[PDB]
Design an enzyme around this catalytic site. Structure first.
Site, PDB file in Angstrom:
ATOM      1  N   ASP A 119     -45.528  -7.465  26.371  1.00 14.47           N
ATOM      2  CA  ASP A 119     -44.820  -8.243  27.355  1.00 14.47           C
ATOM      3  C   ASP A 119     -44.091  -9.404  26.639  1.00 14.47           C
ATOM      4  O   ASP A 119     -44.479  -9.817  25.543  1.00 14.47           O
ATOM      5  CB  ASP A 119     -45.808  -8.795  28.379  1.00 14.47           C
ATOM      6  CG  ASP A 119     -45.152  -9.646  29.396  1.00 14.47           C
ATOM      7  OD1 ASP A 119     -44.121  -9.232  29.958  1.00 14.47           O
ATOM      8  OD2 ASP A 119     -45.655 -10.751  29.601  1.00 14.47           O
ATOM      9  N   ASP A 174     -42.512 -12.691  28.483  1.00 12.15           N
ATOM     10  CA  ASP A 174     -42.790 -14.036  29.008  1.00 12.15           C
ATOM     11  C   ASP A 174     -44.294 -14.279  29.109  1.00 12.15           C
ATOM     12  O   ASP A 174     -44.999 -13.543  29.799  1.00 12.15           O
ATOM     13  CB  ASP A 174     -42.156 -14.241  30.393  1.00 12.15           C
ATOM     14  CG  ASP A 174     -40.660 -14.251  30.356  1.00 12.15           C
ATOM     15  OD1 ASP A 174     -40.098 -14.990  29.535  1.00 12.15           O
ATOM     16  OD2 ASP A 174     -40.045 -13.552  31.197  1.00 12.15           O
ATOM     17  N   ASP A 193     -49.903 -10.964  29.521  1.00  6.42           N
ATOM     18  CA  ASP A 193     -50.565 -12.093  30.172  1.00  6.42           C
ATOM     19  C   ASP A 193     -50.630 -11.945  31.677  1.00  6.42           C
ATOM     20  O   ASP A 193     -51.211 -12.814  32.348  1.00  6.42           O
ATOM     21  CB  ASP A 193     -49.868 -13.409  29.859  1.00  6.42           C
ATOM     22  CG  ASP A 193     -48.494 -13.520  30.503  1.00  6.42           C
ATOM     23  OD1 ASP A 193     -47.700 -12.556  30.346  1.00  6.42           O
ATOM     24  OD2 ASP A 193     -48.180 -14.568  31.115  1.00  6.42           O
TER      25      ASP A 193
END
Ligand SMILES: [Mg+2]
Length: 217
Positions: free
Chosen positions: A7, A9, A167
């Site tokens: 991922d 961001d 996250d």
């Protein structure tokens, strides 16, 4: 001969605070504002859908396109200001270590693909990543498995031999649905219990720790 799907961001790029701030800037430009908690709930999710939800309008409302374009301008300026500083400490070095150990690397982000590539180019991620996919690269974005399956195909690595690092709950859900192992990280938008509950195999507290988890198997 394994794959690592990352991922952007809140995982590779230390953008949650800037995303919240620039979202607020864009709403103020549009003459409005929303609760802090509402903005926080959107951080790192697909942008037009998020802005539509914050404005309280259909995604096809012209106000959404206006806000998305303004966001793109402001965020692009932020990324040019930051360059490689946009990334968490240890990210480029960690990716290089994974490459050295024979892992093929991809990005799977809820940003649109053009934005993802521009960010990769400005930060130096571009020379480490074999494949980049964003929300518009596939018909069904996160939390569906499709983006992860698409990048696995791009890497030439079967899903079974890929690990997803992210996250967000949508990253964990995407990885699990794709039949991949999931390493959650706790330094982005989610706490560790929420990631475990969403199906993370483990949760670590820094990017170097995620790299170590992959290297040690
Ligand atoms: Mg994220």
């Amino acid at each position: 001969d394994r794959g690592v799907i990352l991922d952007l961001d809140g995982t590779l790029a230390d953008t949650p605070a800037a995303i919240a701030t620039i979202t607020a800037e864009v709403l103020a430009a549009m003459g409005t504002a929303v609760s802090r908690g509402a903005i926080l709930s959107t951080v790192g999710r697909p942008l037009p859908a998020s802005l539509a939800g914050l404005l309280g309008v259909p995604v096809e409302d012209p106000r959404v396109a206006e806000a998305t374009e303004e966001y793109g301008r402001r965020f692009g300026a932020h990324v040019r200001a930051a360059g490689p500083r946009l990334l968490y400490p240890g990210v480029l070095e960690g990716l290089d270590r994974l490459s050295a150990a024979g892992f093929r690397l991809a990005m799977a982000t809820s940003k649109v693909e053009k934005a993802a590539r521009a960010i990769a180019e400005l930060t130096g991620l571009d020379t480490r990543l074999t494949v980049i996919a964003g929300d518009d690269s596939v018909e069904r974005g996160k939390p569906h498995p499709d983006m992860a399956l698409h990048v696995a195909r791009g890497l030439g690595i079967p899903p079974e031999r890929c690990v997803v690092i992210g996250d967000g709950v949508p990253d964990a859900e995407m990885g699990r649905a794709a039949g991949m192992t999931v390493i959650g990280v706790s330094y982005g938008v989610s706490g560790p219990d929420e990631l475990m509950r969403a199906g993370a195999d483990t949760v670590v507290d820094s990017f170097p720790a995620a790299v170590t988890a992959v290297l040690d198997g």
